[PDB]
């Protein structure tokens, strides 16, 4: 009688190039873990 | 009768390039862990 | 009859490049851990 | 009959580059841990 | 020489039922509007 | 030589039901409006 | 040579029901408006 | 050669119900407006 969720993200040595435009923007993550009961 | 959620994020040696534009912006994360009951 | 949530974030040796623009801005994180009951 | 939340953040040797702009701005974190009951 | 994007969302009289579980969670939206040029 | 983005959201008379669980949680929105050039 | 972004949100007469649980939590919004150039 | 961002939020007659739990929590908003140049 339970719910569970998990998210994992990782980056390795990002932005190592030279003479260039390397802007970085994070994204969106949503994790839902729940148990619901009615009456 | 429970709910659980977990999120993990990691970065390794970011922004090591030279002579470049390397701006960094964080993103959005939402974690929901709950148990609900009605009556 | 409980809810739980956890978030973990880490950075390793960030901003080590030379002769460059390396601005850093934090992001947004929201963690919800709760138990609700009606009547 | 309880709710719990936890957030952990860490940084390792940040801002070690030379001859560069390395401004640092913190982000936003919100943790909610509560138990609610009606009637 | 331009890019444009727009998103619109609306809800009308939501959650009006009685004696029920009506939890509401928002979703994710991403809008990109930009112009890029190389050399 | 420009980029533009816009997002609009609206709610009308939300949470008007009786004898019920009507929790409300906001979602995530990301708008990007920018112009980039290289050399 | 410019970037622009805008976000608008509105709520009308929220939480008007009786004898119920009507908790309200705000969400996350991120707006980026910028112009970048390299060399 | 400029960047601009704007966010607007409004609420109308919130929390008008009777005999109920109507807790209110604000959310998170981030606005970025800037112009960057390298060399």
From Swiss-Prot, chains A, B, C, D, E, F, G, H:
S-S pairs: none
PTM section of the record: Phosphorylated in its N-terminal serine residues upon induced DNA damage. ATM and DNA-PK are able to phosphorylate FUS N-terminal region.
Coiled-coil ranges (or none): none
Involvement in disease: A chromosomal aberration involving FUS is found in a patient with malignant myxoid liposarcoma. Translocation t(12;16)(q13;p11) with DDIT3.
Record function comment: DNA/RNA-binding protein that plays a role in various cellular processes such as transcription regulation, RNA splicing, RNA transport, DNA repair and damage response. Binds to ssRNA containing the consensus sequence 5'-AGGUAA-3'. Binds to nascent pre-mRNAs and acts as a molecular mediator between RNA polymerase II and U1 small nuclear ribonucleoprotein thereby coupling transcription and splicing. Also binds its own pre-mRNA and autoregulates its expression; this autoregulation mechanism is mediated by non-sense-mediated decay.
Quaternary structure and partners: Self-oligomerizes (via N-terminal region). Oligomerization is essential for chromatin binding. Component of nuclear riboprotein complexes. Interacts with ILF3, TDRD3 and SF1. Interacts through its C-terminus with SFRS13A. Interacts with OTUB1 and SARNP. Interacts with LRSAM1. Interacts with SAFB1 in a DNA-dependent manner; this interaction tethers FUS to chromatin. Interacts with MATR3. Interacts with SNRNP70 and POLR2A; these interactions couple RNA transcription and splicing.
Family the entry assigns: Belongs to the RRM TET family.
Protein name: RNA-binding protein FUS
Organism, as annotated: Homo sapiens (Human)
Gene name in the database record: FUS
């Amino acid at each position: 009688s339970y719910g569970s969720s998990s998210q994992s993200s990782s980056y390795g040595q990002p932005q190592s190039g030279s003479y260039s435009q390397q802007p970085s923007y994070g994204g969106q993550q949503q994790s839902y873990g729940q148990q619901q009961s009615y009456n």
